RNA sequence: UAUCUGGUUGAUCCUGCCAGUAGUCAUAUGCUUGUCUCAAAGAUUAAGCCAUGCAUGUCUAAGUAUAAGCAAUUUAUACAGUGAAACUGCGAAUGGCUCAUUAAAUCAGUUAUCGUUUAUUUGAUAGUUCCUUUACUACAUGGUAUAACUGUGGUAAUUCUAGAGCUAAUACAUGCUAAUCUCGACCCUUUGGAAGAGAUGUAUUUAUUAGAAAUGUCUUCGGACUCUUUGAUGAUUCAUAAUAACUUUUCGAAUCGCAUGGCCUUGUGCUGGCGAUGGUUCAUUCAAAUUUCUGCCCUAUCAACUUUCGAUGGUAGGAUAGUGGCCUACCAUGGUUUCAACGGGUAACGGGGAAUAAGGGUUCGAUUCCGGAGAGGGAGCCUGAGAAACGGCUACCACAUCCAAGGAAGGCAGCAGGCGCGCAAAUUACCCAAUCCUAAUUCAGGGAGGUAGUGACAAUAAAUAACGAUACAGGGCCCA
RNA sequence: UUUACUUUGAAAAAAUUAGAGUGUUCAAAGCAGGCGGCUCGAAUAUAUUAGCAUGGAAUAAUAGAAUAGG
């Protein structure tokens, strides 16, 4: 038969989900950043835990070991590129100091809200899912899209979108036709 | 029916193995070819690969080599006198390797007079027992070929210590 | 001995 | 099984071929030929997945039966013909000549050569013996039986064979200080010079090799192939010169 | 367990205790089920039983067409295009499925074949002149022969076939056609001529044999004068060579396509190209068989086991591709074991792996890859390089289809699809375009495989709304 | 002295795991090459025991024509 296609889970249930502090924290995160449900928070927590565990394991190693240098340099490069880690902040110890919030701001929905294309996180999500936002030349309809530093400042309304230059949507032209009639 | 696999036998410790698999062709066996004195009857056998084997059901004639003079002559086989493995083969006159048989003295004798001109003298000297055999008219020979495989009954004549031992056993 | 030295271009048309 | 196998699963194929695991279920099974299965590159892989001249098996069949491909100076029409190390592949229509040599990664590399280089190949003397009628002969790593060898030519030496006629132009002894190429193991594709042939009676011989960077490594003798004296290889080497 | 809640009295604290609250994974099941990508389909320890359909056939210029086949032609003078059928060659021994059996067995790692077979691929490899009946086919031998086909027939019935008449080969069986090399006297002094003395394949079997103070002279200053003379492995009776015979004994091209070049003394004279298919031996490659060492769960309330009918070892023989108690004949009495032999159980195929865990560990692993075994259960075989084959064959046991009762035909643990209940679960779908595999081979075939369909197997992303204005009212919220 | 033991090197298929690069629109994934010499690019790692080679002073066994006799 055909060779297997590997797969993996991108999230894990926290250790004891029902902590009142944890429930309030998820409430705050979801409200501030307009997350649909708790699975998004669990996913990003899983990713952050993986990253921070890797950073800890590398930190355990002595300074100047080949594996520590190579893996740490790669991890710092990726974190700096994605934008969670600032340029002046390039050390594994500071990787241990990251939080989920940083990745949350790096979401495309949050960037669209902050840039002023949308006045609210929910409005930003609605715009993303309706194909009105383009990163560079590419239309992106995934709110969980992770925006790089370079890609950050190319976010714009898509050329095909009515807000980005194209003809008015069906509602507008329907209303115009009925008014004409 | 005949198979050779080591599996059906008991283990060294004495434990008995279970049947690992069915019998395989590549571990087969075939019936013995009890070659006997009689009109030449040989039949081929299709063996593994494209090769072939000859089965000597009957032979009279064999190629026997006089080593001490370095010759080889074809000769009739008189009969089986002694075989070291199993004496019923001697009783039944079954031809196999290492069997001790009797061969005619004629071609060897005539070659002897022809080459040596004697029925020079020092070279013509021969071991006494074989001269007695010549006078008898039959020679003791040992089969070195495998009639069950090659279809031949080639052999060599007994001499010296070999000859003395086999006469003593006789 | 040295290896052999290394050695069609895009074309564009607009219509309509 | 009960007889020779005629299929090869993609996951079971040699890794160095670089076959996509999801492309299909089966990989080209190299037919019988000069080189062993695991150490060979079938012509289909070379023409399709490496040169990209053909887009699937069928155009490869078309190319081959057009007789445009020559291996070892001879036209071959079997898609799964097992081309191997130091085999010269000529495509005259394109005016291209390739010699199959592993890269430092261990993978057969597309190495272009001149016609003059293509005129000759190198073969490791795997056996030297007297044949029928008392005629000495040498068996090389590619299964070529060459009669009337130079009697100094010994096992583990290398002979330069003219493709057109198949005679020995010259030979190199296996001695310390010669330049060697690794044809197996983790060090596969590395180039260096001999330092010692460590010898074990009844056991596999081991050879110590020093590269141009002065790094030293040990490999089994079966994986060593002499290609020249230091600083003067008899063949053009791929990019990187077998370093790292 | 932790954490959280509650109960322990007339109440409140401080303890202590008790109850419930953790977890993925696994089995079964209920409800819901819009979009994208992706992917799986076992289980009554029932390897239990199966209707129907399909899953292995194959032809290039190059083995064999007077098909009374088709079409052609400069309208055919042995044939020539294409080509059913049949003979011949190759494949069917790969692939797919399942885990019944199996506890040093398989299997993993690691060794050996100086212990043996090996179609195919690839590279090498074969002038033997002559030898009485030459009374002579090699400008090419026979039926010691048949299919397809024509025609006469049987049976209820099957991929059943009888008699008679025909004709082919790369089928079967036979059989041939002035060479090369050593020395070389004599001339000649080289590009030398040669009176003559000599030598002549493989394959099988046996025996024997081999296989280990020239420090000078002259010379042209170069060079010449005499001698050497097998190889490998750690190791061999190895490789190889030689002598003497031997063989119901082989091989040494009686094959085919395309094309018409070169010499002449002008003859259908001589010679000659590019390919296919065959053939002896060696090597290589794909393989196969045995094999060296270490490693398996529970059981001691299994302590002695194996040996009469081979158990351990010696000799000889038979057998095999070959080693070997593999078997036979004669011999000895050996072999394993509290370092657990032997016996019993195993819902025991082994492994790469999967889950969990902080680490040690524990469990699972039929299931995409490798290896082993099997095709309802035993036993035995033809063919072929390769099978103890079962989509090959024969007998026996259990089932079970047809029947005119005389006989004939069986093996889905292949793809679909059914039964096993009276309670249930993917389509008897399309295709060889991708992957590669088989063949005489680009082209044909491939339920291998792919495409799509079908219960939320397991996974990824993610809609069900967002944006304003206006009006009215005073209470809304948190702790206790 | 020999062994045990220990360091290092070969070896332990692929797939799987860890890891590096890559805007599959993101992701699960898949993937090895780009510019006209550019000093660009999976750099790779990983396995208890068995066997092989190799450096070892200790530890634990094992040895002596050791400090013997005239
Ligand atoms: Mg649109
Ligand atoms: Mg060896
Ligand atoms: Mg339901
Ligand atoms: Mg809806
Ligand atoms: Mg849509
Ligand atoms: Mg015709
Ligand atoms: Mg034709
Ligand atoms: Mg048992
Ligand atoms: Mg064992
Ligand atoms: Mg073939
Ligand atoms: Mg051949
Ligand atoms: Mg007839
Ligand atoms: Mg024996
Ligand atoms: Mg007995
Ligand atoms: Mg079982
Ligand atoms: Mg398994
Ligand atoms: Mg079987
Ligand atoms: Mg069944
Ligand atoms: Mg059977
Ligand atoms: Mg089958
Ligand atoms: Mg079936
Ligand atoms: Mg089925
Ligand atoms: Mg299927
Ligand atoms: Mg042909
Ligand atoms: Mg080890």
mmCIF file with all atom_site columns, C-alpha atoms in Angstrom, chain B:
data_model
loop_
_atom_site.group_PDB
_atom_site.id
_atom_site.type_symbol
_atom_site.label_atom_id
_atom_site.label_alt_id
_atom_site.label_comp_id
_atom_site.label_asym_id
_atom_site.label_entity_id
_atom_site.label_seq_id
_atom_site.pdbx_PDB_ins_code
_atom_site.Cartn_x
_atom_site.Cartn_y
_atom_site.Cartn_z
_atom_site.occupancy
_atom_site.B_iso_or_equiv
_atom_site.pdbx_formal_charge
_atom_site.auth_seq_id
_atom_site.auth_comp_id
_atom_site.auth_asym_id
_atom_site.auth_atom_id
_atom_site.pdbx_PDB_model_num
ATOM 1   C CA . UNK B 1 1   ? 9.034  -39.885 0.831   1.00 0.00 ? 1   UNK B CA 1
ATOM 2   C CA . UNK B 1 2   ? 12.766 -39.707 1.476   1.00 0.00 ? 2   UNK B CA 1
ATOM 3   C CA . UNK B 1 3   ? 13.754 -36.434 3.147   1.00 0.00 ? 3   UNK B CA 1
ATOM 4   C CA . UNK B 1 4   ? 16.968 -35.249 4.779   1.00 0.00 ? 4   UNK B CA 1
ATOM 5   C CA . UNK B 1 5   ? 15.960 -32.277 6.921   1.00 0.00 ? 5   UNK B CA 1
ATOM 6   C CA . UNK B 1 6   ? 17.478 -32.120 10.391  1.00 0.00 ? 6   UNK B CA 1
ATOM 7   C CA . UNK B 1 7   ? 14.124 -30.999 11.782  1.00 0.00 ? 7   UNK B CA 1
ATOM 8   C CA . UNK B 1 8   ? 12.342 -34.321 12.282  1.00 0.00 ? 8   UNK B CA 1
ATOM 9   C CA . UNK B 1 9   ? 15.245 -35.570 14.411  1.00 0.00 ? 9   UNK B CA 1
ATOM 10  C CA . UNK B 1 10  ? 15.477 -34.978 18.138  1.00 0.00 ? 10  UNK B CA 1
ATOM 11  C CA . UNK B 1 11  ? 17.465 -32.074 19.526  1.00 0.00 ? 11  UNK B CA 1
ATOM 12  C CA . UNK B 1 12  ? 20.913 -32.518 21.036  1.00 0.00 ? 12  UNK B CA 1
ATOM 13  C CA . UNK B 1 13  ? 19.485 -32.116 24.541  1.00 0.00 ? 13  UNK B CA 1
ATOM 14  C CA . UNK B 1 14  ? 16.935 -34.837 23.730  1.00 0.00 ? 14  UNK B CA 1
ATOM 15  C CA . UNK B 1 15  ? 13.937 -32.557 23.235  1.00 0.00 ? 15  UNK B CA 1
ATOM 16  C CA . UNK B 1 16  ? 11.763 -33.333 20.213  1.00 0.00 ? 16  UNK B CA 1
ATOM 17  C CA . UNK B 1 17  ? 11.051 -30.525 17.763  1.00 0.00 ? 17  UNK B CA 1
ATOM 18  C CA . UNK B 1 18  ? 7.608  -29.768 16.352  1.00 0.00 ? 18  UNK B CA 1
ATOM 19  C CA . UNK B 1 19  ? 6.858  -29.675 12.638  1.00 0.00 ? 19  UNK B CA 1
ATOM 20  C CA . UNK B 1 20  ? 8.116  -26.259 11.554  1.00 0.00 ? 20  UNK B CA 1
ATOM 21  C CA . UNK B 1 21  ? 6.891  -26.584 7.962   1.00 0.00 ? 21  UNK B CA 1
ATOM 22  C CA . UNK B 1 22  ? 5.926  -29.037 5.247   1.00 0.00 ? 22  UNK B CA 1
ATOM 23  C CA . UNK B 1 23  ? 8.507  -31.056 3.350   1.00 0.00 ? 23  UNK B CA 1
ATOM 24  C CA . UNK B 1 24  ? 10.444 -29.042 0.762   1.00 0.00 ? 24  UNK B CA 1
ATOM 25  C CA . UNK B 1 25  ? 11.565 -30.150 -2.685  1.00 0.00 ? 25  UNK B CA 1
ATOM 26  C CA . UNK B 1 26  ? 15.071 -28.763 -2.199  1.00 0.00 ? 26  UNK B CA 1
ATOM 27  C CA . UNK B 1 27  ? 15.565 -31.230 0.701   1.00 0.00 ? 27  UNK B CA 1
ATOM 28  C CA . UNK B 1 28  ? 14.357 -34.304 -1.196  1.00 0.00 ? 28  UNK B CA 1
ATOM 29  C CA . UNK B 1 29  ? 15.756 -37.797 -1.479  1.00 0.00 ? 29  UNK B CA 1
ATOM 30  C CA . UNK B 1 30  ? 15.466 -40.607 -3.997  1.00 0.00 ? 30  UNK B CA 1
ATOM 31  C CA . UNK B 1 31  ? 15.581 -44.380 -3.980  1.00 0.00 ? 31  UNK B CA 1
ATOM 32  C CA . UNK B 1 32  ? 18.937 -46.221 -3.932  1.00 0.00 ? 32  UNK B CA 1
ATOM 33  C CA . UNK B 1 33  ? 20.409 -47.545 -7.176  1.00 0.00 ? 33  UNK B CA 1
ATOM 34  C CA . UNK B 1 34  ? 21.650 -51.034 -6.285  1.00 0.00 ? 34  UNK B CA 1
ATOM 35  C CA . UNK B 1 35  ? 23.979 -51.550 -9.221  1.00 0.00 ? 35  UNK B CA 1
ATOM 36  C CA . UNK B 1 36  ? 24.484 -55.246 -9.973  1.00 0.00 ? 36  UNK B CA 1
ATOM 37  C CA . UNK B 1 37  ? 26.451 -57.298 -12.471 1.00 0.00 ? 37  UNK B CA 1
ATOM 38  C CA . UNK B 1 38  ? 24.359 -57.644 -15.604 1.00 0.00 ? 38  UNK B CA 1
ATOM 39  C CA . UNK B 1 39  ? 23.844 -56.240 -19.077 1.00 0.00 ? 39  UNK B CA 1
ATOM 40  C CA . UNK B 1 40  ? 24.542 -52.515 -19.109 1.00 0.00 ? 40  UNK B CA 1
ATOM 41  C CA . UNK B 1 41  ? 21.363 -50.750 -18.001 1.00 0.00 ? 41  UNK B CA 1
ATOM 42  C CA . UNK B 1 42  ? 21.663 -47.064 -17.099 1.00 0.00 ? 42  UNK B CA 1
ATOM 43  C CA . UNK B 1 43  ? 18.883 -44.473 -16.904 1.00 0.00 ? 43  UNK B CA 1
ATOM 44  C CA . UNK B 1 44  ? 19.287 -40.729 -16.493 1.00 0.00 ? 44  UNK B CA 1
ATOM 45  C CA . UNK B 1 45  ? 17.810 -38.665 -13.663 1.00 0.00 ? 45  UNK B CA 1
ATOM 46  C CA . UNK B 1 46  ? 16.680 -35.048 -13.899 1.00 0.00 ? 46  UNK B CA 1
ATOM 47  C CA . UNK B 1 47  ? 18.240 -33.355 -10.871 1.00 0.00 ? 47  UNK B CA 1
ATOM 48  C CA . UNK B 1 48  ? 18.252 -29.851 -9.428  1.00 0.00 ? 48  UNK B CA 1
ATOM 49  C CA . UNK B 1 49  ? 19.157 -27.284 -12.031 1.00 0.00 ? 49  UNK B CA 1
ATOM 50  C CA . UNK B 1 50  ? 19.725 -28.261 -15.626 1.00 0.00 ? 50  UNK B CA 1
ATOM 51  C CA . UNK B 1 51  ? 22.181 -30.932 -14.504 1.00 0.00 ? 51  UNK B CA 1
ATOM 52  C CA . UNK B 1 52  ? 21.563 -34.665 -14.871 1.00 0.00 ? 52  UNK B CA 1
ATOM 53  C CA . UNK B 1 53  ? 22.581 -37.840 -13.048 1.00 0.00 ? 53  UNK B CA 1
ATOM 54  C CA . UNK B 1 54  ? 23.155 -41.383 -14.295 1.00 0.00 ? 54  UNK B CA 1
ATOM 55  C CA . UNK B 1 55  ? 21.760 -44.413 -12.449 1.00 0.00 ? 55  UNK B CA 1
ATOM 56  C CA . UNK B 1 56  ? 23.730 -47.632 -12.931 1.00 0.00 ? 56  UNK B CA 1
ATOM 57  C CA . UNK B 1 57  ? 21.147 -50.390 -12.654 1.00 0.00 ? 57  UNK B CA 1
ATOM 58  C CA . UNK B 1 58  ? 23.545 -52.862 -14.297 1.00 0.00 ? 58  UNK B CA 1
ATOM 59  C CA . UNK B 1 59  ? 27.175 -52.853 -15.482 1.00 0.00 ? 59  UNK B CA 1
ATOM 60  C CA . UNK B 1 60  ? 29.795 -55.468 -16.372 1.00 0.00 ? 60  UNK B CA 1
ATOM 61  C CA . UNK B 1 61  ? 32.636 -53.241 -17.526 1.00 0.00 ? 61  UNK B CA 1
ATOM 62  C CA . UNK B 1 62  ? 34.785 -50.827 -15.575 1.00 0.00 ? 62  UNK B CA 1
ATOM 63  C CA . UNK B 1 63  ? 37.960 -48.843 -16.067 1.00 0.00 ? 63  UNK B CA 1
ATOM 64  C CA . UNK B 1 64  ? 40.668 -50.005 -13.685 1.00 0.00 ? 64  UNK B CA 1
ATOM 65  C CA . UNK B 1 65  ? 43.992 -48.226 -13.324 1.00 0.00 ? 65  UNK B CA 1
ATOM 66  C CA . UNK B 1 66  ? 47.307 -49.925 -12.614 1.00 0.00 ? 66  UNK B CA 1
ATOM 67  C CA . UNK B 1 67  ? 48.917 -47.130 -10.620 1.00 0.00 ? 67  UNK B CA 1
ATOM 68  C CA . UNK B 1 68  ? 52.443 -48.498 -10.188 1.00 0.00 ? 68  UNK B CA 1
ATOM 69  C CA . UNK B 1 69  ? 52.934 -48.370 -13.973 1.00 0.00 ? 69  UNK B CA 1
ATOM 70  C CA . UNK B 1 70  ? 50.495 -45.517 -14.636 1.00 0.00 ? 70  UNK B CA 1
ATOM 71  C CA . UNK B 1 71  ? 48.078 -47.199 -17.048 1.00 0.00 ? 71  UNK B CA 1
ATOM 72  C CA . UNK B 1 72  ? 44.318 -47.694 -17.221 1.00 0.00 ? 72  UNK B CA 1
ATOM 73  C CA . UNK B 1 73  ? 42.441 -50.480 -18.994 1.00 0.00 ? 73  UNK B CA 1
ATOM 74  C CA . UNK B 1 74  ? 38.790 -51.387 -19.451 1.00 0.00 ? 74  UNK B CA 1
ATOM 75  C CA . UNK B 1 75  ? 37.949 -54.772 -17.987 1.00 0.00 ? 75  UNK B CA 1
ATOM 76  C CA . UNK B 1 76  ? 34.996 -57.019 -17.258 1.00 0.00 ? 76  UNK B CA 1
ATOM 77  C CA . UNK B 1 77  ? 33.906 -57.219 -13.628 1.00 0.00 ? 77  UNK B CA 1
ATOM 78  C CA . UNK B 1 78  ? 33.838 -60.803 -12.389 1.00 0.00 ? 78  UNK B CA 1
ATOM 79  C CA . UNK B 1 79  ? 32.025 -60.426 -9.077  1.00 0.00 ? 79  UNK B CA 1
ATOM 80  C CA . UNK B 1 80  ? 31.927 -58.719 -5.707  1.00 0.00 ? 80  UNK B CA 1
ATOM 81  C CA . UNK B 1 81  ? 34.206 -60.419 -3.186  1.00 0.00 ? 81  UNK B CA 1
ATOM 82  C CA . UNK B 1 82  ? 34.033 -58.065 -0.192  1.00 0.00 ? 82  UNK B CA 1
ATOM 83  C CA . UNK B 1 83  ? 32.477 -54.713 0.722   1.00 0.00 ? 83  UNK B CA 1
ATOM 84  C CA . UNK B 1 84  ? 33.428 -52.868 3.924   1.00 0.00 ? 84  UNK B CA 1
ATOM 85  C CA . UNK B 1 85  ? 30.036 -51.347 4.742   1.00 0.00 ? 85  UNK B CA 1
ATOM 86  C CA . UNK B 1 86  ? 27.529 -54.201 4.552   1.00 0.00 ? 86  UNK B CA 1
ATOM 87  C CA . UNK B 1 87  ? 28.142 -57.822 3.593   1.00 0.00 ? 87  UNK B CA 1
ATOM 88  C CA . UNK B 1 88  ? 24.726 -58.449 2.026   1.00 0.00 ? 88  UNK B CA 1
ATOM 89  C CA . UNK B 1 89  ? 25.932 -56.220 -0.803  1.00 0.00 ? 89  UNK B CA 1
ATOM 90  C CA . UNK B 1 90  ? 28.697 -58.806 -1.194  1.00 0.00 ? 90  UNK B CA 1
ATOM 91  C CA . UNK B 1 91  ? 26.131 -61.598 -1.084  1.00 0.00 ? 91  UNK B CA 1
ATOM 92  C CA . UNK B 1 92  ? 23.906 -59.838 -3.630  1.00 0.00 ? 92  UNK B CA 1
ATOM 93  C CA . UNK B 1 93  ? 26.911 -58.662 -5.699  1.00 0.00 ? 93  UNK B CA 1
ATOM 94  C CA . UNK B 1 94  ? 25.915 -55.014 -5.389  1.00 0.00 ? 94  UNK B CA 1
ATOM 95  C CA . UNK B 1 95  ? 28.354 -52.533 -6.928  1.00 0.00 ? 95  UNK B CA 1
ATOM 96  C CA . UNK B 1 96  ? 29.141 -49.395 -4.927  1.00 0.00 ? 96  UNK B CA 1
ATOM 97  C CA . UNK B 1 97  ? 32.191 -47.329 -4.072  1.00 0.00 ? 97  UNK B CA 1
ATOM 98  C CA . UNK B 1 98  ? 34.826 -49.025 -1.881  1.00 0.00 ? 98  UNK B CA 1
ATOM 99  C CA . UNK B 1 99  ? 33.520 -52.482 -2.848  1.00 0.00 ? 99  UNK B CA 1
ATOM 100 C CA . UNK B 1 100 ? 36.210 -55.098 -3.504  1.00 0.00 ? 100 UNK B CA 1
ATOM 101 C CA . UNK B 1 101 ? 35.646 -56.942 -6.786  1.00 0.00 ? 101 UNK B CA 1
ATOM 102 C CA . UNK B 1 102 ? 37.407 -59.298 -9.194  1.00 0.00 ? 102 UNK B CA 1
ATOM 103 C CA . UNK B 1 103 ? 38.461 -58.240 -12.702 1.00 0.00 ? 103 UNK B CA 1
ATOM 104 C CA . UNK B 1 104 ? 39.917 -60.119 -15.652 1.00 0.00 ? 104 UNK B CA 1
ATOM 105 C CA . UNK B 1 105 ? 43.708 -60.213 -15.994 1.00 0.00 ? 105 UNK B CA 1
ATOM 106 C CA . UNK B 1 106 ? 43.780 -60.216 -19.790 1.00 0.00 ? 106 UNK B CA 1
ATOM 107 C CA . UNK B 1 107 ? 44.338 -56.629 -21.045 1.00 0.00 ? 107 UNK B CA 1
ATOM 108 C CA . UNK B 1 108 ? 46.715 -55.847 -18.184 1.00 0.00 ? 108 UNK B CA 1
ATOM 109 C CA . UNK B 1 109 ? 48.670 -59.024 -18.875 1.00 0.00 ? 109 UNK B CA 1
ATOM 110 C CA . UNK B 1 110 ? 48.963 -58.451 -22.624 1.00 0.00 ? 110 UNK B CA 1
ATOM 111 C CA . UNK B 1 111 ? 50.040 -54.869 -22.028 1.00 0.00 ? 111 UNK B CA 1
ATOM 112 C CA . UNK B 1 112 ? 52.642 -56.246 -19.619 1.00 0.00 ? 112 UNK B CA 1
ATOM 113 C CA . UNK B 1 113 ? 54.263 -58.565 -22.163 1.00 0.00 ? 113 UNK B CA 1
ATOM 114 C CA . UNK B 1 114 ? 53.947 -55.981 -24.933 1.00 0.00 ? 114 UNK B CA 1
ATOM 115 C CA . UNK B 1 115 ? 55.704 -53.223 -22.990 1.00 0.00 ? 115 UNK B CA 1
ATOM 116 C CA . UNK B 1 116 ? 58.267 -55.383 -21.159 1.00 0.00 ? 116 UNK B CA 1
ATOM 117 C CA . UNK B 1 117 ? 58.624 -58.291 -23.593 1.00 0.00 ? 117 UNK B CA 1
ATOM 118 C CA . UNK B 1 118 ? 58.544 -60.614 -20.583 1.00 0.00 ? 118 UNK B CA 1
ATOM 119 C CA . UNK B 1 119 ? 55.887 -63.050 -19.413 1.00 0.00 ? 119 UNK B CA 1
ATOM 120 C CA . UNK B 1 120 ? 64.722 -54.118 -18.399 1.00 0.00 ? 120 UNK B CA 1
ATOM 121 C CA . UNK B 1 121 ? 64.284 -57.140 -16.142 1.00 0.00 ? 121 UNK B CA 1
ATOM 122 C CA . UNK B 1 122 ? 64.604 -54.969 -13.029 1.00 0.00 ? 122 UNK B CA 1
ATOM 123 C CA . UNK B 1 123 ? 61.801 -52.710 -14.260 1.00 0.00 ? 123 UNK B CA 1
ATOM 124 C CA . UNK B 1 124 ? 59.767 -55.809 -15.129 1.00 0.00 ? 124 UNK B CA 1
ATOM 125 C CA . UNK B 1 125 ? 60.012 -56.923 -11.492 1.00 0.00 ? 125 UNK B CA 1
ATOM 126 C CA . UNK B 1 126 ? 56.568 -56.760 -9.880  1.00 0.00 ? 126 UNK B CA 1
ATOM 127 C CA . UNK B 1 127 ? 55.290 -57.452 -6.383  1.00 0.00 ? 127 UNK B CA 1
ATOM 128 C CA . UNK B 1 128 ? 54.961 -61.187 -5.811  1.00 0.00 ? 128 UNK B CA 1
ATOM 129 C CA . UNK B 1 129 ? 51.318 -61.295 -4.727  1.00 0.00 ? 129 UNK B CA 1
ATOM 130 C CA . UNK B 1 130 ? 50.105 -59.559 -7.879  1.00 0.00 ? 130 UNK B CA 1
ATOM 131 C CA . UNK B 1 131 ? 52.150 -61.987 -9.967  1.00 0.00 ? 131 UNK B CA 1
ATOM 132 C CA . UNK B 1 132 ? 50.316 -64.786 -8.170  1.00 0.00 ? 132 UNK B CA 1
ATOM 133 C CA . UNK B 1 133 ? 47.057 -63.035 -9.068  1.00 0.00 ? 133 UNK B CA 1
ATOM 134 C CA . UNK B 1 134 ? 48.130 -62.855 -12.724 1.00 0.00 ? 134 UNK B CA 1
ATOM 135 C CA . UNK B 1 135 ? 48.820 -66.588 -12.594 1.00 0.00 ? 135 UNK B CA 1
ATOM 136 C CA . UNK B 1 136 ? 45.373 -67.083 -11.061 1.00 0.00 ? 136 UNK B CA 1
ATOM 137 C CA . UNK B 1 137 ? 43.670 -65.148 -13.871 1.00 0.00 ? 137 UNK B CA 1
ATOM 138 C CA . UNK B 1 138 ? 41.694 -62.658 -11.749 1.00 0.00 ? 138 UNK B CA 1
ATOM 139 C CA . UNK B 1 139 ? 42.719 -59.469 -9.951  1.00 0.00 ? 139 UNK B CA 1
ATOM 140 C CA . UNK B 1 140 ? 41.349 -57.830 -6.803  1.00 0.00 ? 140 UNK B CA 1
ATOM 141 C CA . UNK B 1 141 ? 40.255 -54.235 -7.413  1.00 0.00 ? 141 UNK B CA 1
ATOM 142 C CA . UNK B 1 142 ? 38.606 -51.484 -5.377  1.00 0.00 ? 142 UNK B CA 1
ATOM 143 C CA . UNK B 1 143 ? 35.865 -49.334 -6.893  1.00 0.00 ? 143 UNK B CA 1
ATOM 144 C CA . UNK B 1 144 ? 36.675 -45.630 -6.594  1.00 0.00 ? 144 UNK B CA 1
ATOM 145 C CA . UNK B 1 145 ? 33.690 -44.356 -8.600  1.00 0.00 ? 145 UNK B CA 1
ATOM 146 C CA . UNK B 1 146 ? 30.105 -44.014 -7.403  1.00 0.00 ? 146 UNK B CA 1
ATOM 147 C CA . UNK B 1 147 ? 27.875 -46.141 -9.673  1.00 0.00 ? 147 UNK B CA 1
ATOM 148 C CA . UNK B 1 148 ? 24.801 -44.600 -8.085  1.00 0.00 ? 148 UNK B CA 1
ATOM 149 C CA . UNK B 1 149 ? 25.798 -41.141 -9.364  1.00 0.00 ? 149 UNK B CA 1
ATOM 150 C CA . UNK B 1 150 ? 28.099 -41.158 -12.403 1.00 0.00 ? 150 UNK B CA 1
ATOM 151 C CA . UNK B 1 151 ? 26.992 -44.427 -13.998 1.00 0.00 ? 151 UNK B CA 1
ATOM 152 C CA . UNK B 1 152 ? 30.595 -45.677 -14.087 1.00 0.00 ? 152 UNK B CA 1
ATOM 153 C CA . UNK B 1 153 ? 32.326 -48.491 -12.222 1.00 0.00 ? 153 UNK B CA 1
ATOM 154 C CA . UNK B 1 154 ? 35.837 -47.115 -12.496 1.00 0.00 ? 154 UNK B CA 1
ATOM 155 C CA . UNK B 1 155 ? 38.299 -48.286 -9.895  1.00 0.00 ? 155 UNK B CA 1
ATOM 156 C CA . UNK B 1 156 ? 41.906 -49.019 -9.104  1.00 0.00 ? 156 UNK B CA 1
ATOM 157 C CA . UNK B 1 157 ? 43.902 -52.168 -8.516  1.00 0.00 ? 157 UNK B CA 1
ATOM 158 C CA . UNK B 1 158 ? 44.965 -53.133 -5.007  1.00 0.00 ? 158 UNK B CA 1
ATOM 159 C CA . UNK B 1 159 ? 48.670 -52.980 -4.161  1.00 0.00 ? 159 UNK B CA 1
ATOM 160 C CA . UNK B 1 160 ? 51.144 -53.029 -1.318  1.00 0.00 ? 160 UNK B CA 1
ATOM 161 C CA . UNK B 1 161 ? 49.791 -52.348 2.150   1.00 0.00 ? 161 UNK B CA 1
ATOM 162 C CA . UNK B 1 162 ? 46.263 -51.891 0.797   1.00 0.00 ? 162 UNK B CA 1
ATOM 163 C CA . UNK B 1 163 ? 46.442 -55.274 -0.934  1.00 0.00 ? 163 UNK B CA 1
ATOM 164 C CA . UNK B 1 164 ? 47.956 -56.999 2.098   1.00 0.00 ? 164 UNK B CA 1
ATOM 165 C CA . UNK B 1 165 ? 45.297 -55.656 4.459   1.00 0.00 ? 165 UNK B CA 1
ATOM 166 C CA . UNK B 1 166 ? 42.408 -56.637 2.205   1.00 0.00 ? 166 UNK B CA 1
ATOM 167 C CA . UNK B 1 167 ? 43.845 -60.119 1.657   1.00 0.00 ? 167 UNK B CA 1
ATOM 168 C CA . UNK B 1 168 ? 44.204 -60.467 5.425   1.00 0.00 ? 168 UNK B CA 1
ATOM 169 C CA . UNK B 1 169 ? 40.580 -59.404 5.876   1.00 0.00 ? 169 UNK B CA 1
ATOM 170 C CA . UNK B 1 170 ? 39.615 -61.968 3.232   1.00 0.00 ? 170 UNK B CA 1
#
